[PDB]
Design a protein around this ligand. Structure first.
Ligand SMILES: [Mg+2]
Ligand SMILES: [Mg+2]
Ligand SMILES: [Mg+2]
Ligand SMILES: [Mg+2]
Ligand SMILES: [Mg+2]
Ligand SMILES: [Mg+2]
Ligand SMILES: [Mg+2]
Ligand SMILES: [Mg+2]
Ligand SMILES: [Mg+2]
Ligand SMILES: [Mg+2]
Ligand SMILES: [Mg+2]
Ligand SMILES: [Mg+2]
Ligand SMILES: [Mg+2]
Ligand SMILES: [Mg+2]
Ligand SMILES: [Mg+2]
Ligand SMILES: [Mg+2]
Ligand SMILES: [Mg+2]
Ligand SMILES: [Mg+2]
Ligand SMILES: [Mg+2]
Ligand SMILES: [Mg+2]
Ligand SMILES: [Mg+2]
Ligand SMILES: [Mg+2]
Ligand SMILES: [Mg+2]
Ligand SMILES: [Mg+2]
Ligand SMILES: [Mg+2]
Ligand SMILES: [Mg+2]
Ligand SMILES: [Mg+2]
Ligand SMILES: [Mg+2]
Ligand SMILES: [Mg+2]
Ligand SMILES: [Mg+2]
Ligand SMILES: [Mg+2]
Ligand SMILES: [Mg+2]
Ligand SMILES: [Mg+2]
Ligand SMILES: [Mg+2]
Ligand SMILES: [Mg+2]
Ligand SMILES: [Mg+2]
Ligand SMILES: [Mg+2]
Ligand SMILES: [Mg+2]
Ligand SMILES: [Mg+2]
Ligand SMILES: [Mg+2]
Ligand SMILES: [Mg+2]
Ligand SMILES: [Mg+2]
Ligand SMILES: [Mg+2]
Ligand SMILES: [Mg+2]
Ligand SMILES: [Mg+2]
Ligand SMILES: [Mg+2]
Ligand SMILES: [Mg+2]
Ligand SMILES: [Mg+2]
Ligand SMILES: [Mg+2]
Ligand SMILES: [Mg+2]
Ligand SMILES: [Mg+2]
Ligand SMILES: [Mg+2]
Ligand SMILES: [Mg+2]
Ligand SMILES: [Mg+2]
Ligand SMILES: [Mg+2]
Ligand SMILES: [Mg+2]
Ligand SMILES: [Mg+2]
Ligand SMILES: [Mg+2]
Ligand SMILES: [Mg+2]
Ligand SMILES: [Mg+2]
Ligand SMILES: [Mg+2]
Ligand SMILES: [Mg+2]
Ligand SMILES: [Mg+2]
Ligand SMILES: [Mg+2]
Ligand SMILES: [Mg+2]
Ligand SMILES: [Mg+2]
Ligand SMILES: [Mg+2]
Ligand SMILES: [Mg+2]
Ligand SMILES: [Mg+2]
Ligand SMILES: [Mg+2]
Ligand SMILES: [Mg+2]
Ligand SMILES: [Mg+2]
Ligand SMILES: [Mg+2]
Ligand SMILES: [Mg+2]
Ligand SMILES: [Mg+2]
Ligand SMILES: [Mg+2]
Ligand SMILES: [Mg+2]
Ligand SMILES: [Mg+2]
Ligand SMILES: [Mg+2]
Ligand SMILES: [Mg+2]
Ligand SMILES: [Mg+2]
Ligand SMILES: [Mg+2]
Ligand SMILES: [Mg+2]
Ligand SMILES: [Mg+2]
Ligand SMILES: [Mg+2]
Ligand SMILES: [Mg+2]
Ligand SMILES: [Mg+2]
Ligand SMILES: [Mg+2]
Ligand SMILES: [Mg+2]
Ligand SMILES: [Mg+2]
Ligand SMILES: [Mg+2]
Ligand SMILES: [Mg+2]
Ligand SMILES: [Mg+2]
Ligand SMILES: [Mg+2]
Ligand SMILES: [Mg+2]
Ligand SMILES: [Mg+2]
Ligand SMILES: [Mg+2]
Ligand SMILES: [Mg+2]
Ligand SMILES: [Mg+2]
Ligand SMILES: [Mg+2]
Ligand SMILES: [Mg+2]
Ligand SMILES: [Mg+2]
Ligand SMILES: [Mg+2]
Ligand SMILES: [Mg+2]
Ligand SMILES: [Mg+2]
Ligand SMILES: [Mg+2]
Ligand SMILES: [Mg+2]
Ligand SMILES: [Mg+2]
Ligand SMILES: [Mg+2]
Ligand SMILES: [Mg+2]
Ligand SMILES: [Mg+2]
Ligand SMILES: [Mg+2]
Ligand SMILES: [Mg+2]
Ligand SMILES: [Mg+2]
Ligand SMILES: [Mg+2]
Ligand SMILES: [Mg+2]
Ligand SMILES: [Mg+2]
Ligand SMILES: [Mg+2]
Ligand SMILES: [Mg+2]
Ligand SMILES: [Mg+2]
Ligand SMILES: [Mg+2]
Ligand SMILES: [Mg+2]
Ligand SMILES: [Mg+2]
Ligand SMILES: [Mg+2]
Ligand SMILES: [Mg+2]
Ligand SMILES: [Mg+2]
Ligand SMILES: [Mg+2]
Ligand SMILES: [Mg+2]
Ligand SMILES: [Mg+2]
Ligand SMILES: [Mg+2]
Ligand SMILES: [Mg+2]
Ligand SMILES: [Mg+2]
Ligand SMILES: [Mg+2]
Ligand SMILES: [Mg+2]
Ligand SMILES: [Mg+2]
Ligand SMILES: [Mg+2]
Ligand SMILES: [Mg+2]
Ligand SMILES: [Mg+2]
Ligand SMILES: [Mg+2]
Ligand SMILES: [Mg+2]
Ligand SMILES: [Mg+2]
Ligand SMILES: [Mg+2]
Ligand SMILES: [Mg+2]
Ligand SMILES: [Mg+2]
Ligand SMILES: [Mg+2]
Ligand SMILES: [Mg+2]
Ligand SMILES: [Mg+2]
Ligand SMILES: [Mg+2]
Ligand SMILES: [Mg+2]
Ligand SMILES: [Mg+2]
Ligand SMILES: [Mg+2]
Ligand SMILES: [Mg+2]
Ligand SMILES: [Mg+2]
Ligand SMILES: [Mg+2]
Ligand SMILES: [Mg+2]
Ligand SMILES: [Mg+2]
Ligand SMILES: [Mg+2]
Ligand SMILES: [Mg+2]
Ligand SMILES: [Mg+2]
Ligand SMILES: [Mg+2]
Ligand SMILES: [Mg+2]
Ligand SMILES: [Mg+2]
Ligand SMILES: [Mg+2]
Ligand SMILES: [Mg+2]
Ligand SMILES: [Mg+2]
Ligand SMILES: [Mg+2]
Ligand SMILES: [Mg+2]
Ligand SMILES: [Mg+2]
Ligand SMILES: [Mg+2]
Ligand SMILES: [Mg+2]
Ligand SMILES: [Mg+2]
Ligand SMILES: [Mg+2]
Ligand SMILES: [Mg+2]
Ligand SMILES: [Mg+2]
Ligand SMILES: [Mg+2]
Ligand SMILES: [Mg+2]
Ligand SMILES: [Mg+2]
Ligand SMILES: [Mg+2]
Ligand SMILES: [Mg+2]
Ligand SMILES: [Mg+2]
Ligand SMILES: [Mg+2]
Ligand SMILES: [Mg+2]
Ligand SMILES: [Mg+2]
Ligand SMILES: [Mg+2]
Ligand SMILES: [Mg+2]
Ligand SMILES: [Mg+2]
Ligand SMILES: [Mg+2]
Ligand SMILES: [Mg+2]
Ligand SMILES: [Mg+2]
Ligand SMILES: [Mg+2]
Ligand SMILES: [Mg+2]
Ligand SMILES: [Mg+2]
Ligand SMILES: [Mg+2]
Ligand SMILES: [Mg+2]
Ligand SMILES: [Mg+2]
Ligand SMILES: [Mg+2]
Ligand SMILES: [Mg+2]
Ligand SMILES: [Mg+2]
Ligand SMILES: [Mg+2]
Ligand SMILES: [Mg+2]
Ligand SMILES: [Mg+2]
Ligand SMILES: [Mg+2]
Ligand SMILES: [Mg+2]
Ligand SMILES: [Zn+2]
Lengths: 16, 204, 122, 118, 59, 131
RNA sequence: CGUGAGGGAAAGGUGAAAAGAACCCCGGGAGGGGAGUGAAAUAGAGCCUGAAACCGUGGGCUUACAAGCAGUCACGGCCCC
RNA sequence: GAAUGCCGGCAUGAGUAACGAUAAAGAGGGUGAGAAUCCCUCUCGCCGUAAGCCCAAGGGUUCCUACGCAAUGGUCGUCAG
RNA sequence: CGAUGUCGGCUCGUCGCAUCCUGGGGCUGAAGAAGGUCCCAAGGGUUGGGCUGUUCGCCCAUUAAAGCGGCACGCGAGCUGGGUUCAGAACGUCGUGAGACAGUUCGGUCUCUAUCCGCCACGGGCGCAGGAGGCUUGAGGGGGGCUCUUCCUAGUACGAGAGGACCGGAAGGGACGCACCUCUGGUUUCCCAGCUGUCCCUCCAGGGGCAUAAGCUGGGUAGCCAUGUGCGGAAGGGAUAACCGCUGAAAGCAUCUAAGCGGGAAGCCCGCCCCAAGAUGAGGCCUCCCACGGCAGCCGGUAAGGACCCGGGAAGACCACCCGGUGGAUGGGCCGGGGGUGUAAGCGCCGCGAGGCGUUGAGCCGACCGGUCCCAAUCGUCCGAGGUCU
């Protein structure tokens, strides 16, 4: 359990 | 360790002391002994029983020769009972009286290719709230890079039923020796008309 | 088959009218309470100035269920509703009467005060 | 599974499968010999023997009952007046499904004949 | 899914090995007791119309 | 080997003939043996048969009563050794074989949909006239 | 191909000479097998030469207790010269 | 010998997904080298503010008939835009 | 960085043990009951709800208990998509401004097809020195492993009282597992009935299609089912853990140990259930054929058997398995029984009529239990040992 929220590294795969 | 081969015939409830007892009826007797396993000959101890007489046409030479070493008429099924050496050369329902407890062994009803819900009681997925084509699906089957594989014996969909099942410690409700019947309280594996094995229980 | 969230009719003069099951007192993780089982419930509707009021947390015993209860003789008996009688921590009724039949199973479970108070024990 | 279930589905729904039997009953009772795929043929025996049997009986009830399927007053007449009497002494088994040796070219379906017995 | 896709081209060995079960079994045929021509058993002989002793169809 | 026969045999020792005939709709009274504590009595249960599901020896019938403002349905095995006697108390003419539909009906509504089976009543009074 | 301005391919070779295969056979046709032409017909038109991947038939050696970047070093066995 | 190189050819996945509305088919008789698929009959089902009919745009011989079936038709084809 | 998809949930788990409970313990400031503390122990178990996207947490009602953790903060080629990274919009705030903020708020495209490994199942091949049909031993492996309450002992030991046992003995539960369909309760696509609109057959009557892939409604067999029923955890034999001892020196005493021996856990090993000789280490037993013709080899004809093809089956995706193939009850029909529906049509009678009464528990009637050669498993074909060497 990690207390500091972990930012995402990828944007949601967006339709080209 | 007494034992007998018989076919399961169907279920009912008799009445006994103002209580209805679910029973299944087993045509047990009679079972001629056709070979005996002894420690000299075979290392262990067991009796080869036969069951249901058979049209001598349908029995090849080698099988028919087996019966002749014992003077038994051609029979349909041959089965051993381990650590059983009866006094006579015919096992019948008489070796069981009411009150006794038995183990009954039979080939279960085959459910064929069974999904993970019917076979392993999994819960599947939601039926709304977004669930997408996984309604009867198992879910995850592993972890990630470690171990990076699926455990042996991982419960999955596949064939389910038509396997051996022994249901144990069933009360012997009645015995009808004139009819070679054998009442048994409760459920017994296999369909009606399926060959079961009735043995003395191993409980307390 | 009473499980939490199930509404029940109260068959006594304790004030209550409907109670809502929130726990079946049958060990760790029992699924449903049949006739004779004890439940903690919430008083959802009740007449004014009763021995119990709206919003209490009472215990009760399930006297009759809408699911049929079976019996070792081979018979079975279902009722038209699921009902209960408010009790105390000593299993005794908290009213002075009960209304409508109660299942005979209460006696075998030891609720003789309720069973005697009934109009019919089926 | 399928345990102890009776009745081919024949990849048709309820109505369609009934028609397929009826329109094959009319055709079998019209010419007394039709060629079909072996599956439909085996299912045709029992659908038609009932109709023949009911004709053998002969009452007004049996004719109106057979009329629910065959729907053709002239064809029902052929059944009662010409077909059924041929079998007054026969105890069921009024039809026969024998298999053919060549298949359909288009889809390889194995075929058989169904004919009213003598 | 996420479009599974083969990782390596299958070898001339692995595809031929797969096809070890793909050979055909020659049709099972018996002689016709009337006209002696090889025909499938339990079918009306398509060369003489006979089956079970008598003639059944015009060939 | 006939297996339905063998099952028919096992049940024979328990079969009853002494009970009267009665169809769905017939109002009826089942004198039933009950075990209340340390004694046994004959509790009666009287009501309308709303269902009869046959399975040879394993046939059962359901009877519906109204006890102190509360519907009560009760299922009996037709060959229960705890059935002392059954008394036909009224003959009703139903149109269906299972009468669950009378659950959601007032008393007046039921009296309309279930009238006295005059043909089975007159046959009843004509029987019992034995000499 | 693009509404349009505009974009913009691929595609050469029988033989010295058509002497381009009459006629026969199987085939519905396509295709073949004979006959025939030619120095040559795996030059026969899907035509000089005709590589490689790729597919297939026959043959030799080998392989169903085996752990692999597939080879390399040794030795033994079988087949051939 | 490599440029997610360029052109072309041929592999793999593989006899695998698919074969394009779940309105629905069945038999008999023709045709023919060959027919589930073409023609004829009868039975059955589907649309019927259309899935019928008439006009306009657009398309440009697709119309009619006769003779054909290599390719086009998601199968077949004796049929066909 | 020519991509290692990111929180939480769902699902499916598995492992560790710094052990929440159950088991075994020593100390206790342990009377008893109940606690504290530490030691052994990972077999199994560890509830349902309110709140918030929440993990976490608080709370409700329980409980034997409501453990903490690893597995890419396990798990998106498994699902979700509420939180969080896009583009819209607004609030507070910062900025002259375009705009910006671990400050809020509403909204916002998650990809049909598995090649290889792995996993669940199921076959084909060859092998297991002669060819075959049966029946088997079990090396090895998996499954399972939970727990509560009341009562008797006994209101006894213990305690001023309140309270309240050890041990031994009976009964009844919860959740979970395997099988089952007699009973309870489902489904039951055409098994029966009722009903509306419309088109039709054939006008009346009687019927058919369609209204869903059952038009609709009331019912419903077998089968498959659970909410239903039976059964399981154990008993027990053994080796131990912490801990307690016996006898006992080194060390005249003492010490559970240095020689030796007891006792001692839900844990380990056997035991129970299931798989299993590809266990190549390919086992054992019963039974069957056997010196075949021609140049450890080859080509053929056979034997015991087997396969093919067919009728099928609570077996089943195909394959496999099991049953039967006329000297036969395998399926289809037919008869009987069951069971469902609940009193057909036709006629008679009563009523102006919708209707009602009677014939009548009739008519119809899937699958269940049987019988019956009426129809279909015709006729046949192909494989198949002659047995290496010390
Ligand atoms: Mg977290
Ligand atoms: Mg892109
Ligand atoms: Mg068996
Ligand atoms: Mg399940
Ligand atoms: Mg299961
Ligand atoms: Mg289960
Ligand atoms: Mg859930
Ligand atoms: Mg669900
Ligand atoms: Mg979605
Ligand atoms: Mg979607
Ligand atoms: Mg999906
Ligand atoms: Mg969905
Ligand atoms: Mg992944
Ligand atoms: Mg690894
Ligand atoms: Mg199996
Ligand atoms: Mg017991
Ligand atoms: Mg049965
Ligand atoms: Mg059998
Ligand atoms: Mg009341
Ligand atoms: Mg009373
Ligand atoms: Mg299924
Ligand atoms: Mg099956
Ligand atoms: Mg299904
Ligand atoms: Mg059948
Ligand atoms: Mg049908
Ligand atoms: Mg289909
Ligand atoms: Mg179809
Ligand atoms: Mg299809
Ligand atoms: Mg329809
Ligand atoms: Mg029938
Ligand atoms: Mg007539
Ligand atoms: Mg009919
Ligand atoms: Mg064939
Ligand atoms: Mg064709
Ligand atoms: Mg995807
Ligand atoms: Mg998708
Ligand atoms: Mg997939
Ligand atoms: Mg590949
Ligand atoms: Mg390759
Ligand atoms: Mg190759
Ligand atoms: Mg290749
Ligand atoms: Mg491959
Ligand atoms: Mg039966
Ligand atoms: Mg009433
Ligand atoms: Mg009326
Ligand atoms: Mg263009
Ligand atoms: Mg242009
Ligand atoms: Mg351009
Ligand atoms: Mg060129
Ligand atoms: Mg020719
Ligand atoms: Mg010619
Ligand atoms: Mg032509
Ligand atoms: Mg030519
Ligand atoms: Mg030529
Ligand atoms: Mg020349
Ligand atoms: Mg040439
Ligand atoms: Mg050359
Ligand atoms: Mg050249
Ligand atoms: Mg040149
Ligand atoms: Mg060339
Ligand atoms: Mg070769
Ligand atoms: Mg080669
Ligand atoms: Mg080898
Ligand atoms: Mg080895
Ligand atoms: Mg190797
Ligand atoms: Mg290594
Ligand atoms: Mg290497
Ligand atoms: Mg060397
Ligand atoms: Mg060499
Ligand atoms: Mg280079
Ligand atoms: Mg590329
Ligand atoms: Mg480049
Ligand atoms: Mg080129
Ligand atoms: Mg290219
Ligand atoms: Mg190419
Ligand atoms: Mg390719
Ligand atoms: Mg290919
Ligand atoms: Mg395939
Ligand atoms: Mg594939
Ligand atoms: Mg497509
Ligand atoms: Mg496909
Ligand atoms: Mg199409
Ligand atoms: Mg549509
Ligand atoms: Mg389509
Ligand atoms: Mg649709
Ligand atoms: Mg429509
Ligand atoms: Mg046609
Ligand atoms: Mg003709
Ligand atoms: Mg065609
Ligand atoms: Mg054709
Ligand atoms: Mg047609
Ligand atoms: Mg045609
Ligand atoms: Mg078509
Ligand atoms: Mg017709
Ligand atoms: Mg209209
Ligand atoms: Mg048009
Ligand atoms: Mg124009
Ligand atoms: Mg155009
Ligand atoms: Mg035209
Ligand atoms: Mg063409
Ligand atoms: Mg063509
Ligand atoms: Mg042309
Ligand atoms: Mg074509
Ligand atoms: Mg197309
Ligand atoms: Mg033509
Ligand atoms: Mg990166
Ligand atoms: Mg970059
Ligand atoms: Mg890359
Ligand atoms: Mg990438
Ligand atoms: Mg990637
Ligand atoms: Mg939550
Ligand atoms: Mg403890
Ligand atoms: Mg303890
Ligand atoms: Mg302690
Ligand atoms: Mg204490
Ligand atoms: Mg104290
Ligand atoms: Mg520890
Ligand atoms: Mg543990
Ligand atoms: Mg709320
Ligand atoms: Mg928030
Ligand atoms: Mg929080
Ligand atoms: Mg507690
Ligand atoms: Mg405790
Ligand atoms: Mg909780
Ligand atoms: Mg965990
Ligand atoms: Mg994670
Ligand atoms: Mg996703
Ligand atoms: Mg996620
Ligand atoms: Mg992935
Ligand atoms: Mg959304
Ligand atoms: Mg969002
Ligand atoms: Mg939001
Ligand atoms: Mg400034
Ligand atoms: Mg400002
Ligand atoms: Mg400023
Ligand atoms: Mg923002
Ligand atoms: Mg943030
Ligand atoms: Mg930010
Ligand atoms: Mg916000
Ligand atoms: Mg919206
Ligand atoms: Mg694969
Ligand atoms: Mg790999
Ligand atoms: Mg694999
Ligand atoms: Mg194998
Ligand atoms: Mg050996
Ligand atoms: Mg051998
Ligand atoms: Mg064998
Ligand atoms: Mg064994
Ligand atoms: Mg073992
Ligand atoms: Mg192994
Ligand atoms: Mg083990
Ligand atoms: Mg355990
Ligand atoms: Mg006491
Ligand atoms: Mg006391
Ligand atoms: Mg005790
Ligand atoms: Mg477990
Ligand atoms: Mg049943
Ligand atoms: Mg059932
Ligand atoms: Mg049932
Ligand atoms: Mg039922
Ligand atoms: Mg029907
Ligand atoms: Mg007309
Ligand atoms: Mg009419
Ligand atoms: Mg109608
Ligand atoms: Mg119509
Ligand atoms: Mg219509
Ligand atoms: Mg329709
Ligand atoms: Mg609708
Ligand atoms: Mg209808
Ligand atoms: Mg229904
Ligand atoms: Mg059923
Ligand atoms: Mg049923
Ligand atoms: Mg249950
Ligand atoms: Mg000492
Ligand atoms: Mg020692
Ligand atoms: Mg001691
Ligand atoms: Mg010990
Ligand atoms: Mg235990
Ligand atoms: Mg075994
Ligand atoms: Mg072996
Ligand atoms: Mg074995
Ligand atoms: Mg080994
Ligand atoms: Mg070896
Ligand atoms: Mg062996
Ligand atoms: Mg051995
Ligand atoms: Mg089975
Ligand atoms: Mg099969
Ligand atoms: Mg089969
Ligand atoms: Mg076999
Ligand atoms: Mg056989
Ligand atoms: Mg045979
Ligand atoms: Mg034969
Ligand atoms: Mg038969
Ligand atoms: Mg039969
Ligand atoms: Mg009946
Ligand atoms: Mg009537
Ligand atoms: Mg009538
Ligand atoms: Mg009438
Ligand atoms: Mg009149
Ligand atoms: Mg009836
Ligand atoms: Mg019947
Ligand atoms: Mg006979
Ligand atoms: Mg022959
Ligand atoms: Zn012939």
């Amino acid at each position: 359990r990690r207390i500091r929220p972990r930012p995402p590294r990828l944007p949601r795969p967006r339709w080209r | 360790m007494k034992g007998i081969l018989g076919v399961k015939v169907g279920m009912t409830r008799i009445f006994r002391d103002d209580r209805a007892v679910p029973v299944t009826v087993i045509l047990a007797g009679p079972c001629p002994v056709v070979q005996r396993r002894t420690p000299e000959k075979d290392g262990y101890t067991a009796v080869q029983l036969g069951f249901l007489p058979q049209n001598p046409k349908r029995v090849n030479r080698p099988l028919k020769g087996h019966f002749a070493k014992a003077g038994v008429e051609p029979v349909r099924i041959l089965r051993e009972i381990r650590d059983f050496n009866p006094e006579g050369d015919t096992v019948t329902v008489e070796i069981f009286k009411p009150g006794e407890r038995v183990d009954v062994t039979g080939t279960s009803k085959g459910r064929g290719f069974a999904g993970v819900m019917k076979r392993w009681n999994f819960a599947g997925g939601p039926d709304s709230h977004g669930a997408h084509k996984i309604h009867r699906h198992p879910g995850s089957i592993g972890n990630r890079k470690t171990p990076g594989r699926v455990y042996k014996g991982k419960k999955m969909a596949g064939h389910y039923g038509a396997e051996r099942v022994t249901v144990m410690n069933l009360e012997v409700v009645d015995v009808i020796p004139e009819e070679n019947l054998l009442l048994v309280k409760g459920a017994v594996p296999g369909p009606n008309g399926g060959l079961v094995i009735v043995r003395e229980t191993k409980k307390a | 088959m009473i499980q939490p969230q199930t509404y029940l009719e109260v068959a006594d003069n304790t004030g209550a009218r409907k109670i809502m099951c929130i726990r079946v007192l049958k060990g760790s993780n029992a699924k449903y309470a049949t006739v004779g089982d004890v439940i903690v419930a919430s008083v959802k509707e009740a007449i004014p100035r009763g021995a119990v009021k709206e919003g209490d947390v009472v215990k009760a015993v399930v006297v009759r269920t809408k699911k049929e209860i079976k019996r070792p003789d081979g018979s079975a008996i279902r009722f038209d509703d699921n009902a209960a009688v408010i009790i105390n921590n000593q299993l005794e009724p908290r009213g002075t009467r009960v209304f409508g039949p109660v299942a005979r199973e209460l006696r075998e479970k030891g609720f003789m005060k309720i069973v005697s108070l009934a109009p019919e024990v089926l | 599974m399928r345990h102890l279930k009776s009745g081919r589905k024949l990849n048709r729904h309820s109505s369609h499968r009934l028609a397929l039997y009826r329109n094959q009953a009319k055709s079998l009772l019209t010419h007394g010999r039709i060629t079909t795929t072996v599956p439909k043929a085996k299912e045709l025996r029992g659908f038609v023997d009932h109709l023949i049997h009911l004709a053998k009986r002969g009452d007004l009830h049996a004719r109106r009952l057979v009329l629910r399927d065959l729907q053709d007053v002239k064809l029902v007449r052929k059944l009662f007046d010409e077909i059924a009497p041929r079998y007054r002494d026969r105890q069921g088994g009024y039809t026969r499904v024998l298999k053919l040796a060549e298949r359909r070219r288009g889809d390889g379906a194995p075929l058989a004949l169904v004919e009213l017995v003598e | 899914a996420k479009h599974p896709v083969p990782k390596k081209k299958t070898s001339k060995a692995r595809r031929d090995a797969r096809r070890s079960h793909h050979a055909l079994t020659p049709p099972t045929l018996v002689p016709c007791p009337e006209c002696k021509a090889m025909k499938p058993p339990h079918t009306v002989c398509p060369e003489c119309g006979y089956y079970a002793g008598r003639k059944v169809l015009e060939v | 080997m006939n297996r339905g026969a063998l099952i028919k045999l096992v049940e024979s020792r328990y079969v009853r003939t002494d009970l009267p005939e009665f169809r769905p709709g017939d109002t009826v009274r089942v004198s039933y043996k009950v075990k209340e504590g340390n004694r046994t009595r004959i509790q009666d249960f009287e009501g309308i048969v709303i269902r009869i599901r046959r399975n040879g020896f394993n046939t059962t019938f359901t009877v519906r009563k109204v006890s102190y403002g509360v519907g009560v349905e009760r299922i009996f095995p037709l060959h229960s050794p705890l059935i002392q006697k059954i008394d036909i108390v009224q003959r009703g003419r139903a149109r269906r074989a299972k009468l669950y539909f009378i659950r959601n009906l007032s008393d007046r509504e039921i009296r309309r949909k279930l009238r006295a089976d005059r043909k089975r009543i007159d046959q009843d009074r004509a029987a019992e006239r034995a000499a």
